[PDB]
Design a protein around this ligand. Structure first.
Ligand code: CA
Ligand code: CA
Ligand code: CA
Ligand code: CL
Ligand code: CL
Ligand code: NA
Ligand code: NA
Ligand code: NA
Length: 479
């Protein structure tokens, strides 16, 4: 069985505290379609009840303590979260928990700190003299007390902040005596700083505490791996060290995927080198390819669709996806793949042998905030393709600027498997492709239902497969 991840949230979910309940309720249904892992949103207390979770306040509050004006998180209570994870496990699915280590917001109090303004466009360039600011850096967690952890956060655990409370100024403030961490991404000179209070990953108390929390969190929740937020903004050598610790101390392999958001493939290869292949990365450049192709009116050269992507260059470390909560309309990385192209992108990541694909909750269930209907009826037949048919040796036909395809011969121990896929960003047509001599004489049909004709395999193992305009067909053998 192929591995298939699902990102189990989107940005515009209502703040109604039901998501963990939905996970428990939907787990069996999802697993039956071949989903094997769920990436859950940050599950700990944010700056308010409605925070999506990246505005992390208290890593140890899983919707259990009366903090930031609520007990539950946006998603539910600690008990509902633990129950969600158990339900996924009963359905035979693994759970990857979102980990937010870049910054910390909603401090309980301020501290007076000598600081300097740096340029948002070049954080290596100081643009003021030293002056004293009132920074939101004091974290005491009075709702939790010392349950689980007695560790308190102060100014010196952070490299800087984005707000002076005394003069009410928005600036990127670097604390005097602190430096931006290295290595990090070099966009804007040094991209360590992102929002709220930025963690100083060179501080030993910070490193020890996050290790402490990592081990506690795995043991407490029974999760199976991690989605790491904002890794280009976090010292590169920190995560290999952290993961080695948490993996050894818990005795779990803890699959981990990092969000290194860049469309520059060489930046991703750099990160993977600097982290010794300890984690996979989201294939952001392939997301860009799908976005671009969807908007190009047929003019995109489909022969290039996976050129300079992680799916091509480093397939065992790629988590492939069509869209996520940041690429949704109105969001920070907005780059939304139009619905006409979306099933083709889904077929590309679901039926090919390269990479670990990830289905987006917002695509699957729809996004009511923008009146975006569910694509479940177009995605399900592709999940079935992956679950039952996408096995064995692949042959590639990325050989025409509209119509591209590939085949899977089927696996010697998954009887009935085998497929031939075609997608086109332009007019439809046909393509001869090799599915395997062993399929000579078999009749193949289009599992998507987009086409009603059939394709019979010739005595050499070749079939003349077909696809409609602007569409996808996934041809599989009759039983
Ligand atoms: Ca630092
Ligand atoms: Ca940072
Ligand atoms: Ca084209
Ligand atoms: Cl200068
Ligand atoms: Cl410095
Ligand atoms: Na510089
Ligand atoms: Na930092
Ligand atoms: Na992020």
């Amino acid at each position: 069985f192929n591995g298939t991840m699902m990102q189990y949230f989107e940005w515009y979910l209502p703040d109604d505290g039901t998501l963990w309940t939905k996970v428990a309720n939907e787990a069996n249904n999802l697993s039956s379609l071949g989903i094997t892992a769920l990436w859950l949103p940050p599950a700990y207390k944010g700056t308010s009840r409605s925070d999506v979770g990246y505005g992390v306040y208290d890593l140890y509050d899983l919707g259990e303590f009366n903090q930031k004006g609520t007990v539950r998180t946006k998603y539910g209570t600690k008990a509902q979260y633990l129950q969600a994870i158990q339900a996924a496990h009963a359905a035979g699915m693994q759970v990857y928990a979102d980990v937010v280590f870049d910054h910390k917001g909603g401090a309980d109090g301020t501290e007076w700190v000598d600081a300097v303004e740096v340029n948002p466009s070049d954080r290596n360039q100081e643009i003021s003299g030293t002056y004293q600011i009132q920074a939101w850096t004091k974290f005491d967690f009075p709702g939790r007390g010392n349950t689980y952890s007695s560790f308190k956060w102060r100014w010196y655990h952070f490299d800087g902040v984005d707000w002076d409370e005394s003069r009410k100024l928005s600036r990127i403030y670097k604390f005097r005596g602190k430096a931006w961490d290295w290595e990090v991404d070099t966009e804007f000179g040094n991209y360590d700083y992102l929002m709220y209070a930025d963690l100083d990953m060179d501080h030993p108390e910070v490193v020890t505490e996050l290790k402490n929390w990592g081990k506690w969190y795995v043991n407490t929740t029974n999760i199976d791996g991690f989605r790491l937020d904002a890794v280009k903004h976090i010292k590169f050598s920190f995560f290999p060290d952290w993961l080695s610790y948490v993996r050894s101390q818990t005795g779990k392999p803890l699959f981990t995927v990092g969000e290194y958001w860049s469309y520059d493939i060489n930046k991703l290869h750099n990160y993977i080198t600097k982290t010794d292949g300890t984690m996979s990365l989201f294939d952001a450049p392939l997301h860009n390819k799908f976005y671009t192709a969807s908007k190009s009116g047929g003019a995109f050269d489909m022969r290039t669709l996976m050129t300079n992507t992680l799916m091509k260059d480093q397939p065992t470390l790629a988590v492939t996806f069509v869209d996520n909560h940041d690429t949704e309309p109105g969001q920070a990385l907005q780059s939304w793949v139009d619905p006409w192209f979306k099933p083709l992108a889904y077929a590309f990541i679901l039926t090919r042998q390269e990479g670990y694909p990830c289905v987006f909750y917002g695509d699957y269930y729809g996004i009511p905030q923008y009146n975006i209907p569910s694509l479940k009826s177009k995605i399900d037949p592709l999940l079935i393709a992956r679950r039952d048919y996408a096995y064995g040796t692949q042959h590639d036909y990325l050989d025409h600027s509209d119509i591209i395809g590939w085949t899977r011969e089927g696996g010697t121990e998954k009887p009935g498997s085998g497929l031939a896929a075609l997608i086109t960003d332009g007019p439809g047509g046909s393509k001869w492709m090799y599915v395997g001599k062993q399929h000579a004489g078999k009749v193949f049909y289009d599992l998507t239902g987009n086409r009603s004709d059939t394709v019979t395999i010739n005595s050499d193992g070749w079939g003349e497969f077909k696809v409609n305009g602007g569409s996808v067909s996934v041809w599989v053998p009759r039983k």
